[PDB]
């Protein structure tokens with residue numbers, strides 16, 4: 097069923113696993129992520145950036161497409177449709193009104209008090225529609241910037257944002273780049289806020305650091321470039337080995353397969369397999 | 375709005391133009407075809423083969439996607455969703471129940487009496503749902519076969535199938551090949567005697583002037599597929615061969631989409647479909 101992130105991330109946090117957010121960019125991306133998660137009996141979060149949504153014509157198109165696939169692929173796992181790095185209240189409202197079940201309102205580059213106000217406004221609207229809300233504090237690093245442009249989430253800011261806004265999940269940047277995670281800080285923030293935590297900039301973080309972060313409260317981990325890299329490699333391989341092929345299905349089919357196998361790998365990493373219940 | 379092909383092809387036949395059927399294979403194909411036709415103020419038919427539908431997970435997924443796009447792209451032109459080369463009553467029914475507005479039941483390789491029976495069955499179901507129906511007679515050629523595997527549709531068969539089944543459009547193979555010289559006088563007699571809009575399969579590579587000749591003889595629907603696949607694949611290759619580092623799917627499938635869009639506009643200009651969509 098289409099659900100928000102709320103209960104799936106609470107279950108993830110409570111039982112020591114994470115649910116991947118896999119970003120979608122078109123039909124084939126969405127098929128691969130849904131099939132992979134269903135085959136793994138795992139809940140899943142479908143991530144949509146604002147740029148990806150423009151590319152896919154709009155939020156409503158995306159929701160329609162997912163509704164189609166839920167039916168045709170016989171999806172029975174929990175599925176959230178999540179606005180990734182939402183830039184404003186208006187954009188969050190637009191996604192929600194089109195049928196999104198979750199939004200991240202990203203005001204982490206604004207003054208903290210403005211982050212609180214804008215996030216609070218998004219939660220008030222979203223919670224009226226059953227939509228879960230993620231917010232962000234701190235900055236993900238990565239040219240030539242001191243401390244590699246890393247700015248840890250402040251534990252007092254984290255606590256205060258949670259208490260004042262009522263968000264369902266928190267993304268505290270704690271050393272990830274786009275690396276050495278502040279596991280001590282992560283533990284403190286998870287315990288103090290009592291919220292499932294979200295990991296951005298996960299691409300390239302070793303499985304061992306990924307699996308250390310998870311019991312410290314990381315319950316959602318974002319995945320995007322890994323799928324793009326794997327799909328693009330499969331397209332290149334098809335086109336480079338057959339100079340005559342033009343049927344889109346003959347290079348985008350393998351791209352879809354490569355995503356599917358990338359996602360199953362992340363699912364195994366994250367412990368998400370067999371967490372979908374009735 | 376979403377409509378069958380019925381009124382669409384009647385208006386085309388009456389006024390001397392054709393509506394392209396542009397086959398979709400995924401989201402970017404559908405976007406390009408809809409945008410191009412809207413921008414040309416032209417009605418359009420979205421063609422879906424059974425293999426393309428399997429690739430896109432199903433008929434229902436395709437209808438939902440199109441509904442999404444109709445909204446987000448502010449589509450105001452007539453749009454038909456058409457099952458291309460439907461292979462059975464069951465497949466035609468499945469597509470119609472999922473929300474398709476048009477089907478082609480292709481029994482042209484079966485004995486003529488079976489073609490009539492299966493097609494009649496499809497029309498009875500489809501017409502109670504407001505769905506238009508295309509059927510086919512004759513064979514599109516193209517290996518080392520006598521007469522290049524071309525078998526003209528039989529005028530008596532054409533006449534009889536139309537009368538017995540009540541189809542809305544007819545695809546009479548008349549010299550098209552796939553992989554040529556159209557029988558223009560045969561096309562004329564069949565158009566005249568059946569009184570139906572005619573469909574051209576195997577249009578790829580038919581020179582613009584034979585296309586231009588076919589239309590006033592009654593050809594009101596022309597199918598377009600490989601031309602789009604060729605243009606989109608070339609755009610992808612060019613992106614990937616010029617930049618070995620790129621992996622963002624939008625950076626090569628975006629240009630693919632634009633390439634389809636410009637291909638479709640070209641066909642729209644050939645077919646005379648521009649500015650035929652009424653408010």
Ligand SMILES: [Zn+2]
Nearest residue numbers: 181296297318
């Ligand atoms: Zn992120």
Ligand SMILES: [Zn+2]
Nearest residue numbers: 459575576597
């Ligand atoms: Zn055909």
